[PDB]
Amino acid sequence: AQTVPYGIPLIKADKVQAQGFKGANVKVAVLDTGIQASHPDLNVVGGASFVAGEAYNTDGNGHGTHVAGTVAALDNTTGVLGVAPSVSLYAVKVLNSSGSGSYSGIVSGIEWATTNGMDVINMSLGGASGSTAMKQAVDNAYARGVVVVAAAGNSGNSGSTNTIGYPAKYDSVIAVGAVDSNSNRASFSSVGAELEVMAPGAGVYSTYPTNTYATLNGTSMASPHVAGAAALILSKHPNLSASQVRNRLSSTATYLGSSFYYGKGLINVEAAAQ
Template sequence: MAGYNRRSFLKLSGTALGGIAVGSSVTAAASSERFLVDTTKTSQSEVEAAGLEVVHDLHEIDVLVVSGAESDIESLGVDYAADSRYSLDLPIDQESPITAEGADETRDEPYYPIQWDKQAQDIPEAHEITRGEDTRVSIIDTGVAAGHPDLAHAVNEDLSQDFTGDGYGAGGPYGGYHGTHVAGIVAANDQNDAGVVGSAPGTEIVDCRVFSPSALASFADILAAMIYSVRIGSDAANLSLGAYPYARQGQGKFYGKVLNRTTTYANSEGTLLVIAAGNDAADLQHDGNVVSLPAEAANVVSVSATGPIGFMNGGEGLESPTYTPAKYTNYGTNAVDIGAPGGNYDADFPAGYYYDLVFNTIAEPQFDSDGNYQGASYGYAWLAGTSMAAPQVAGAAALVRSQNPGLNANQVRKTLTSSADTVEEFDKTYYGSGVLNPYAALK
């Protein structure tokens, strides 16, 4: 086994630890210039004739995303809503997370010993069956660093796409480190004698960037990325993002309508949408007339987070098992489909709590004073959230589809949920069908 040394491993590239609760989002102001237009009673030519510019053509779901004056849209007499933008929840500590310095078998990757999440899922045993070959997973997020040593084998830069229009392009961590961490959980290389391992290192990653540097992601761009994932035949699309709480009335009702069209279309075409349930510690089943988007949409896999307390806590061992519901995770009967490792924490372990988080790839972008991209620093870091739980499921979906390429999205979902581990110690509302077990799914 390649050397793992606690002393060298804890060298800091910054001064702060990775944070808790990465991945839920909060709603920001609605746009006064971009709108989603329902085209079931109009056409693109009529929309353009009204003086509106088409930003995204989502004809598969009878929606156009347009820019222009609201009065021009009103003249069409169609249903529409202003686009909204969302800000990604950042870690509690805003500084740089801990990064680590840098085999033929999964267990021989240098940092596998601290990947409790992969150990709990029996990922080495799963890789004896398949590593996810001949599959594709879209990462709809802040951008994936194609140059990271543990992801260079996986990212398809030709298919990767920037949905923000900010000019930075795709295949880089332009919107932050979050997307690279998510992608590593799915597909970090298990055969390069370095770093960490992903659940499906044989899969292909497509970067679908919807966040800009220090900016927000729009609902419309997220929809466009989902539709694009279907167009390119992604077996799964991971969305470690969302907005909560969102009112079911008004604009929320329109959003729910077009979102359900999108998720139903994706499901029918074979793309499994895997979505973080959120980090608000909220009971989504009994939270009044509000909704979590897109986690509570139809035909998606909504993922809650689990994690241990006291991993690597010397001779004392675990204080709580890896399937313990995370303190921050959203939950709720009929709102959560499955639980997966996302990381946990306990204030009683201040010196080593980060070992209970999820360790994987990271890339921190660097810009000059004019906003020009100067490259990224690559490393590894601990983060936690349903953001980290969702890609565990997306990776497992790639494994299942690799083994059984003829399965449709419903069958992949059923395989994952029916093989999930039942947990007796904690309330079922935290897990839906149970805790993800990729190896059992393949068996």
């Protein structure tokens, strides 16, 4: 029995897939803690590790295998279902078993992604401070046609103090906030003027270490829904430029309220892709 997480139908991923578009030919790189490549519900085609002592194909934390699952859990008779199940998955390890990464490691991951022709980059990570190297790394990738997607942050909204993290804060990166199954903004979701779009981030079930599946909360779970949506949009319209894919996502987002808390609203892949 394959489970279908609320997240896929909520963003209308199921409608698009039913049309035949599943992300085939689109190269998606997941910049995270790696992925458990042996997971039976995943097909990791390659990648690289910029973390010392850990190869790219193992995940001693769980976070990367979970994010990876939301994007591409295989469409079959077992486990869960990804947003773009026929995508080419590349595991780029830039975070350690503790889920922490240095700027250089991340920067290497971004550069590797660009140099190796990836189509979409997912970054479910973020710090309080940026870096000039990271900004260059991300500007060039996007300018080279790569769709950059990152988690907005899990600092909630205490105050009126823009809590968007980096690299989400950068102009070339799409900042993704999180909503629950009722489409309401999850309390932990970062707010700020850079907040672009929302996606399911509360209570998302996906592939998890050592051939199992678990439920997690966080904007980190939200980002992969958008990365996969970009992959769907690209599989249906391969001649689109990154920003064009970007524009479809924002323009067709379902209005939820003030952008400071919701961006342009909840993504709708069917409207975005047509």
